[PDB]
Design a protein around this ligand. Structure first.
Ligand SMILES: [Mg+2]
Length: 69
RNA sequence: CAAAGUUGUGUAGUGCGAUCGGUGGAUGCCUUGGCACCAAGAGCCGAUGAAGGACGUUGUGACCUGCGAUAAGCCCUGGGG
């Protein structure tokens, strides 16, 4: 899974929790990469892409491009 | 055999020719680059912060191109497969 437009079915607070969880996962991945672990390197970019998606949804809600749930 | 006389000279090197190579990158044939134009556009950008940059950004060392900590990319829409 890589997240998609179903993030628009979530609420603001749980989307922000999603942001925090994604940031923590990226932190762990970066530490693994530094320490020599993390064979799965593509996730290291996909997590940042997911953060971008969640910020996209939040900003469209904030700017009223899409009606806020 | 002696006497008198004649002629000859490449083991150092060199010249010329032929031949076989080396160096060199001319020539010929090209080209992801230029040059001069034609036709149609567009003729402004900027405090909603420009022109141009610095630094950063990739699974990984650099540089170029793109991008800006949402960082060779995020979303919507249409096309295409
Ligand atoms: Mg003209």
């Amino acid at each position: 899974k890589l997240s998609a437009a179903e993030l628009r079915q979530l609420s603001g607070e749980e989307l922000r929790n999603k942001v925090r969880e994604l940031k923590e996962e990226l932190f762990g991945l970066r530490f693994q990469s530094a320490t020599g672990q993390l064979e799965n390197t593509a996730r290291l970019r996909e997590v940042r892409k997911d953060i971008a998606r969640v910020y996209t949804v939040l900003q469209e809600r904030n700017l009223n491009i899409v009606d806020d749930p």
